[PDB]
């Protein structure tokens, strides 16, 4: 489960768990929109299952990138849930729900 840490002032921490078989069996994720409405301008990496610095981590993992004007929920380089960023930070949505 996650968040399982805290680093001494709220601030849930990342974790590392390199799975041997690659993909998991189930991936119920959830993110509130009061948490996506707090990124700065140009946003960046709301959540991920791989670090964005590795070798070809785009076509392997899951990336929720909040760029300017949009929040794109990709997959193995296959967009699933583009959503505008002016209705997220307005009370238009409730929670981003991912499942695999």
């Amino acid at each position: 489960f996650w968040p399982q840490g805290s680093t001494a002032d709220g601030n849930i921490t990342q974790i590392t768990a390199p799975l041997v078989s690659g993909a998991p069996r189930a991936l119920d994720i959830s993110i509130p929109c009061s948490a996506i409405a707090t990124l700065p301008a140009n946003g960046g990496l709301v959540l991920s299952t791989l670090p964005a610095g590795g070798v070809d981590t785009g076509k392997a993992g899951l990336f929720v990138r909040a760029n300017q004007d949009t929040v794109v929920v990709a997959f193995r380089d296959s967009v699933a849930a583009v959503a505008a960023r002016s209705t997220i930070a307005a009370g238009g949505c409730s929670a981003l729900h991912i499942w695999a």
Partner: protein, 243 residues
């Protein structure tokens, strides 16, 4: 596969004067003729990409091709024997084009008369799209049997020796005469030969005999929904060769 070339038909056709394959192969000299003109009489919505871009060409850019992209080949490190000059030519042009591109075009296409549109960037990929303008279509004939679009990138189309070779989308939809709106009426999947070589300037071809007799216009449609840095697309306007 008849009345076209076959061994048994050629052997007996060589009695009354036959040249083998030199009769069934058509060649296009001066591949700068046959370019159609946009039906849309609007110099408005067409932005910095021209009539090839159309309305909201988001994702596409004139300089959207990698560096050593050549016609029907892939450049490698050491000097290979029997290669074209476009393996060694300068990587850019010392002038812009009609769009504003500095990409060397293949087959002898004049970069001062032929625009371009590509979806190759470094960093911050996205989902592209392009819907060209309505290109008028001449009256049919027997000597002009196909429509051609010179394109590079990862494209999905049929061929012999390979089933489907999936990829991105170029479909050249067409229209039929009506009250004056020219709504689309169909789509066509290209016939490319260099499907397993995704960077080759491969000259896609659409047979004219498949679309209906009274077709007024056509237009290009390209998607590129893949965010991989090596899944890109590039296109030029359609033309009717002379053959």
């Amino acid at each position: 596969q008849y009345p076209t070339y076959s061994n048994g038909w050629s052997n007996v056709r060589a009695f009354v004067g036959g040249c083998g394959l030199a009769d069934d192969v058509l060649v296009e000299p001066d591949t700068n003729a046959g370019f159609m003109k946009p039906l849309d009489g609007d110099s408005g919505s067409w932005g910095p990409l021209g009539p090839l871009g159309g309305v909201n060409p988001v994702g596409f850019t004139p300089n959207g091709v990698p560096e050593h992209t050549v016609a029907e080949a892939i450049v490698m490190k050491p000097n290979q024997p029997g290669t074209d000059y476009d393996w060694d030519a300068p990587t850019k042009l010392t002038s812009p084009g009609i769009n504003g591109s500095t990409v060397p075009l293949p087959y002898g296409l004049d970069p001062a008369r032929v625009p371009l549109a590509g979806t190759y960037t470094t960093g911050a990929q996205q989902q592209s799209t392009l819907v060209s303008a309505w290109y008028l279509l001449p009256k049919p004939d027997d000597g002009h049997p196909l429509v051609v679009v010179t394109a590079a990138g990862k494209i999905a189309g049929n061929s012999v020796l390979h089933g489907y070779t999936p990829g991105q989308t170029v479909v050249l939809e067409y229209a039929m005469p009506g009250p004056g709106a020219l709504v689309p009426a169909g789509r066509m999947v290209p016939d490319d030969l260099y499907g397993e070589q995704p960077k080759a300037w491969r000259n896609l071809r659409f047979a004219r005999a498949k679309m209906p007799a009274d077709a007024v216009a056509v237009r290009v449609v390209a998607e590129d929904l893949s965010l991989t840095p090596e899944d890109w697309i590039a296109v030029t306007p359609p033309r009717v060769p002379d053959l």
